[PDB]
Amino acid sequence: MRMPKSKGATVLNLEHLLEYAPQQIDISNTRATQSQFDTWYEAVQLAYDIGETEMPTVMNGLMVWCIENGTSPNINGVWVMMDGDEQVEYPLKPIVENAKPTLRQIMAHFSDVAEAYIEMRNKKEPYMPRYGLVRNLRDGSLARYAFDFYEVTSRTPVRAREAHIQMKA
Amino acid sequence: MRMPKSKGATVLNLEHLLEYAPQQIDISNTRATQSQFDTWYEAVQLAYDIGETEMPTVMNGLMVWCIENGTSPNINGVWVMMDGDEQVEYPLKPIVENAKPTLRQIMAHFSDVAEAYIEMRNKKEPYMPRYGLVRNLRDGSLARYAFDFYEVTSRTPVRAREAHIQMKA
Amino acid sequence: MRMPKSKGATVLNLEHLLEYAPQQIDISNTRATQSQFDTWYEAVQLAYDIGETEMPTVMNGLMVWCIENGTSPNINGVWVMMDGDEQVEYPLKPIVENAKPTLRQIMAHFSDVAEAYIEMRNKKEPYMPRYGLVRNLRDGSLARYAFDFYEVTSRTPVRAREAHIQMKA
Amino acid sequence: MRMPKSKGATVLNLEHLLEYAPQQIDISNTRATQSQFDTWYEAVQLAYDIGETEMPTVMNGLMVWCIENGTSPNINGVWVMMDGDEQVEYPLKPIVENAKPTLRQIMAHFSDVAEAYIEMRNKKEPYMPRYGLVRNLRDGSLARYAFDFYEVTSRTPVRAREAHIQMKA
Amino acid sequence: MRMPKSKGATVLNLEHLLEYAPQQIDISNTRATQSQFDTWYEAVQLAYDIGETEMPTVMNGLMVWCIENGTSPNINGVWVMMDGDEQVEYPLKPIVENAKPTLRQIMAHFSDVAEAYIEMRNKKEPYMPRYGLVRNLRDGSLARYAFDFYEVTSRTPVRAREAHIQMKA
Numbered sequence: 001m002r003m004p005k006s007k008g009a010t011v012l013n014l015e016h017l018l019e020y021a022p023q024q025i026d027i028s029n030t031r032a033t034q035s036q037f038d039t040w041y042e043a044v045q046l047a048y049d050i051g052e053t054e055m056p057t058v059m060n061g062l063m064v065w066c067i068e069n070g071t072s073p074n075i076n077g078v079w080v081m082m083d084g085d086e087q088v089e090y091p092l093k094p095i096v097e098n099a100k101p102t103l104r105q106i107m108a109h110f111s112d113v114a115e116a117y118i119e120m121r122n123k124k125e126p127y128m129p130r131y132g133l134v135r136n137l138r139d140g141s142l143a144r145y146a147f148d149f150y151e152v153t154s155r156t157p158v159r160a161r162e163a164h165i166q167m168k169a
Numbered sequence: 170m171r172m173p174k175s176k177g178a179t180v181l182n183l184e185h186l187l188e189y190a191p192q193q194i195d196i197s198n199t200r201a202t203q204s205q206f207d208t209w210y211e212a213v214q215l216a217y218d219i220g221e222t223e224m225p226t227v228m229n230g231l232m233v234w235c236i237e238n239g240t241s242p243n244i245n246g247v248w249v250m251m252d253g254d255e256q257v258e259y260p261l262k263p264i265v266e267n268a269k270p271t272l273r274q275i276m277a278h279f280s281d282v283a284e285a286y287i288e289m290r291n292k293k294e295p296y297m298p299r300y301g302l303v304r305n306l307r308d309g310s311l312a313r314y315a316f317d318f319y320e321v322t323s324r325t326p327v328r329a330r331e332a333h334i335q336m337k338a
Numbered sequence: 339m340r341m342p343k344s345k346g347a348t349v350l351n352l353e354h355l356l357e358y359a360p361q362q363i364d365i366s367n368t369r370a371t372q373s374q375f376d377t378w379y380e381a382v383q384l385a386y387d388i389g390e391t392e393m394p395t396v397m398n399g400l401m402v403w404c405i406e407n408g409t410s411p412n413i414n415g416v417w418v419m420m421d422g423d424e425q426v427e428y429p430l431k432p433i434v435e436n437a438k439p440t441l442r443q444i445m446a447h448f449s450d451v452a453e454a455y456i457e458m459r460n461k462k463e464p465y466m467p468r469y470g471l472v473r474n475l476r477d478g479s480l481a482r483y484a485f486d487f488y489e490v491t492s493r494t495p496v497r498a499r500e501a502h503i504q505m506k507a
Numbered sequence: 508m509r510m511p512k513s514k515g516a517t518v519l520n521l522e523h524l525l526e527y528a529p530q531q532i533d534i535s536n537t538r539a540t541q542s543q544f545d546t547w548y549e550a551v552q553l554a555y556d557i558g559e560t561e562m563p564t565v566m567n568g569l570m571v572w573c574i575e576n577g578t579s580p581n582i583n584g585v586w587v588m589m590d591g592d593e594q595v596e597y598p599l600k601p602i603v604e605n606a607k608p609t610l611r612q613i614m615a616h617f618s619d620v621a622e623a624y625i626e627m628r629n630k631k632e633p634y635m636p637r638y639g640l641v642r643n644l645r646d647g648s649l650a651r652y653a654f655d656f657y658e659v660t661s662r663t664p665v666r667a668r669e670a671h672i673q674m675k676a
Numbered sequence: 677m678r679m680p681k682s683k684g685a686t687v688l689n690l691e692h693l694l695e696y697a698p699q700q701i702d703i704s705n706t707r708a709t710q711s712q713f714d715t716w717y718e719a720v721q722l723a724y725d726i727g728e729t730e731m732p733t734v735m736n737g738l739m740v741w742c743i744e745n746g747t748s749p750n751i752n753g754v755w756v757m758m759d760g761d762e763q764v765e766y767p768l769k770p771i772v773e774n775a776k777p778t779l780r781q782i783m784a785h786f787s788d789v790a791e792a793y794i795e796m797r798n799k800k801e802p803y804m805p806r807y808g809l810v811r812n813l814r815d816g817s818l819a820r821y822a823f824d825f826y827e828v829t830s831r832t833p834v835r836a837r838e839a840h841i842q843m844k845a
């Protein structure tokens with residue numbers, strides 16, 4: 001093999017070269033960077049006039065809303081939260097404006113947790129996310145992966161990779 | 170797994186995260202929100218000069234009309250109600266103007282009840298909604314699902330999902 | 339045979355003609371020339387204000403970043419390095435501007451080493467570069483070749499040649 | 508690179524230039540200078556016979572008026588303030604006079620605050636400034652940029668830059 | 677080939693022509709000559725009553741002003757310097773006078789240094805000169821070329837050549 005050279009010197013080290021072991025999600029372009037996610041968090045927090053005691057509760061339903069309604073909604077719209085049987089409405093402009101590059105990449109930070117919620121739902125009655133009810137997904141084991149902000153990593157079953165290709169087609 | 174992080178703190182809670190259990194129809198974009206449905210109700214009520222004693226009766230036939238004539242009609246038109254053998258006419262502009270985002274989403278609040286009416290009809294003589302007589306649906310058990318404002322949830326038989334895909338194609 | 343002639347004289351020699359034995363990568367247009375790589379190295383070094391003691395470490399992650407995120411990114415963007423659990427951000431404009439003719443050819447100097455890193459990763463948990471998770475590559479032995487700046491030489495297995503044709507299609 | 512030279516000596520420090528980091532709005536010709544704004548403030552104060560206890564209230568209504576009626580009005584005209592349900596009438600020549608170079612540049616000092624007021628109005632009922640209701644702007648998210656005295660800096664989203672080009676055309 | 681001839685004798689050495697290798701900027705008409713620049717320097721120095729200890733600081737702000745406000749301003753105007761938070765006001769006729777042929781050609785001597793300042797600003801927050809924010813330049817990499825007194829030589833990337841043609845159109 002040949003290691004990169006510049007003016008007769010190696011430019012890629014020898015020890016740390018075979019020691020750097022990052023995580024796939026961290027250095028991937030499918031999700032927004034940590035700085036971008038932080039900016040989106042406070043911008044949404046400042047727009048809704050919510051403190052640090054109710055904001056975690058509010059963001060629980062936004063992830064659930066994006067499971068069943070996607071991550072590319074109309075800006076001039078609203079997304080719903082339910083406190084009991086009442087539909088509590090929130091403006092959707094702050095969610096999208098302050099999300100860079102796209103809301104899907106920002107929502108991709110919720111990929112791991114969103115499967116836990118769907119698996120919970122798939123313990124009482126069959127629950128299939130709408131994103132999979134419009135692309136004709138019949139499997140009941142792939143319901144945990146039927147949201148548009150899912151991150152495909154090197155831990156995803158092969159059937160799921162084919163399903164997302166079929167879904168997005 | 171990794172839960173969303175912002176400035177070294179979890180932003181998705183731990184207990185209410187695995188307790189929020191909404192209903193699919195409530196947080197879905199296939200139907201208008203409760204506020205939107207309320208606005209459409211009074212706007213139509215105020216346009217027809219009807220009180221709270223005949224309006225429930227009038228809206229019974231509007232749902233039946235939309236079963237057999239769809240939810241995307243010409244605004245400058247009329248929809249018919251039958252009191253005995255006489256065709257009582259109502260303007261159709263108030264139904265569509267005041268419906269946001271679309272009349273189909275507003276009519277989607279009648280998805281559950283519209284199946285009860287069709288099943289009633291399918292107890293004396295075979296009744297197939299027109300929306301299914303123009304897309305060549307031959308099954309007699311799918312007649313209860315042959316209206317354009319049907320809501321596909323995680324309780325719909327798999328054959329029905331294929332039928333609507335075939336119908337809308 | 340006929341050897342090139344000009345004014346009644348051979349113009350291709352006889353001894354050194356059958357002695358010149360270059361290497362395929364050196365005289366190939368799939369990678370930038372040594373002068374071009376040197377210019378890109380110092381230009382990136384001068385833009386980041388880094389000496390000759392940390393620059394080899396920084397370029398380790400840029401190669402890893404290009405494995406999972408390609409070699410044609412948006413100039414007005416950033417690429418991430420991880421020191422522990424923190425995302426250290428670098429501007430991406432110096433990487434692309436000063437790379438001639440393209441960053442893929444400049445990154446092609448890292449083709450040999452990038453396989454060593456992937457093979458390392460493929461010793462603890464299955465690691466498939468993202469560039470192969472979006473083109474539906476299922477083989478686990480071709481993971482070492484699933485980056486866009488791979489150089490196809492006369493040492494590459496035949497299956498790999500077909501895979502890259504299928505991947506790039 | 509080459510420095511500017513005069514009689515064999517450098518004419519630029521290039522050490523304080525590294526220090527020199529002015530703000531874009533301060534050294535821009537899109538807004539009047541601080542001295543010009545001070546002249547306009549006192550002259551308007553002297554024309555309306557108002558002290559330093561009601562003038563801050565007075566200029567609150569002037570900024571809102573320029574949002575909905577532009578910054579190029581007739582000199583022989585009036586601008587309206589509302590105290591309750593009554594229209595308080597103010598002469599408009601004191602505004603369009605003593606405002607150099609133009610009233611738009613003087614009004615550009617209110618660009619930041621004018622967006623806070625618009626974002627306030629877009630929390631109860633949809634509010635689009637009349638400047639955007641005559642140029643066919645159908646995106647309510649861009650309502651915060653629909654005043655002619657908006658200042659385009661290097662913090663404006665790319666959407667707003669295209670919208671203003673479309674509006675001013 | 678044919679040499680220029682006069683009375684049966686060559687009029688060109690063609691041995692010193694091989695020696696003659698001038699710089700493109702030096703013998704270009706896009707910038708004022710050295711004598712013209714020296715005249716503009718002393719005349720501006722004599723007009724502002726400033727010595728040789730503060731003038732290098734003074735011209736630092738003038739170059740930045742021309743980046744964001746162009747090199748064709750009104751003679752009966754002022755250009756702003758910032759010492760801290762205060763706007764220092766300077767007359768602008770001493771600048772647009774004693775600057776022949778044009779101020780742009782005089783300002784062209786700062787083309788190399790003006791890019792260093794812009795590249796400095798594009799290290800903390802995105803900074804695009806106002807010259808490019810009014811001509812719809814959406815590429816932040818080309819921010820280093822977004823001043824009207826830029827000199828196009830045979831070292832400018834092909835991107836910048838097309839951008840300036842698009843901008844000046």
